[PDB]
């Protein structure tokens, strides 16, 4: 079948195109496909440092003091409340410089983001409430794991669900 | 497609059922349609749409496609093995001691009210 | 300058009127972590 298959593939005029695809593609400086370097390079902070052949405008020099400041914030889950603007702004500048942008976030982004956030969480908790009672109760972790087994399209996988399946402790401990 | 059989040959799987090539080709068509659709949206986005502000002219460079694919794999497509996450997470679990007890030659079950008692379900 | 916690408690006191008071240490932490992940992914 293999020989006959190759012969029939040669029956098509694309035998020439098939003959040319012998090299190693990605004719670039490279596209690594390993794992550990993806991880590391996706773990260290980057820095948007710029060239200046003739003129690279922007009128505001690039800094990486911002990235350190961003990674140092008392982010959520330590504190007990959703972050107020200032914390979120400090974290964003870090991410924007860390991805390769420049210029300061303009104080409307934070608010629309908070808005979308609280909408998200109201949806989730409405789901859990729809689980526990049909029509004086009090809610637990297991109900939220149940509803994130039923509806997983809500949350993006990674990070937290694995962490969620490592917090379900037994009674005595 | 015969080339799909040729691609099957790479993984030592010469035992197909002949529905697979139809199905996977259908799949790739669906996938790339969605991909180069939202990439076209982003090409519009660089072209500063609303209820009449400018035209819509297509180039579709590779960067837009890269954007349209990274959003998909943001919630799909089993990624690189997330080892470090699992290592630290499991160290957090692998922290509190074993029970260090003796049920004395039987089985030790969870307490009833955590056991199931698989009776005929009834109202 | 200007003369210088009730966000989640308001996010949940307005959902229901039959108690349904969530617990910290188990549930609240989950939600804070979800919010963090959401903001990071979106801004990226």
């Amino acid at each position: 079948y293999e020989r006959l298959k190759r012969d029939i593939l040669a029956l098509p005029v694309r035998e020439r195109r098939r003959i040319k695809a012998i090299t190693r593609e990605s004719g670039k400086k490279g596209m690594v496909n390993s794992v550990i370097t993806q991880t590391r390079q996706a773990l260290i902070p980057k820095v948007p440092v710029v060239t200046r052949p003739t003129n690279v405008p922007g009128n505001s020099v690039q800094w990486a003091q911002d990235v350190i400041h961003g990674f140092q914030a008392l982010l959520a889950s330590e504190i007990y409340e959703l972050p107020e603007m200032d914390n979120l702004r400090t974290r964003m500048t870090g991410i924007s410089r860390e991805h390769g942008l420049i210029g300061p976030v303009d104080d409307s982004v934070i608010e629309i983001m908070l808005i979308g956030l609280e909408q998200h969480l109201k949806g989730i908790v409405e789901a859990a409430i729809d689980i526990v009672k049909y029509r004086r109760h009090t809610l637990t972790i297991e109900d939220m794991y149940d509803t994130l087994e039923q509806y997983p399209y809500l949350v993006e996988p990674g990070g937290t669900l694995l962490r969620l399946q490592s917090v379900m402790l037994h009674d005595e401990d | 497609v015969r080339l799909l059989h040729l691609i099957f040959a790479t993984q030592n799987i010469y035992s197909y059922q002949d529905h697979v090539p139809l199905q996977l080709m259908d799949f790739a068509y669906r996938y790339t349609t969605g991909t180069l659709q939202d990439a076209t949206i982003y090409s519009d986005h660089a072209h500063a749409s609303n209820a009449g502000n400018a035209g819509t002219n297509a180039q579709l460079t590779t960067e837009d496609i890269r954007l349209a694919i990274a959003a998909r794999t943001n919630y799909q497509f089993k990624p690189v093995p997330p080892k470090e996450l699992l290592l630290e997470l499991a160290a957090e679990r692998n922290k509190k001691p074993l029970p260090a007890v003796i049920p004395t030659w039987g089985i030790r079950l969870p307490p009833e009210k955590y056991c199931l008692t698989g009776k005929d379900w009834v109202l | 300058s200007q003369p210088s916690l009730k966000e989640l408690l308001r996010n949940v006191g307005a959902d229901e009127g039959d108690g349904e008071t969530v617990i910290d240490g188990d549930v609240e932490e989950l939600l804070l972590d979800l919010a963090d992940e959401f903001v990071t992914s979106v801004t990226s």
Partner: peptide
Amino acid sequence: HQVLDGVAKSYPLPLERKVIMPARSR
């Protein structure tokens, strides 16, 4: 003939991969 078997060594790639890395760990 066998020339095409020797040529068929594509080694395809993706464009982008995700990396599951939360904020807290890093």
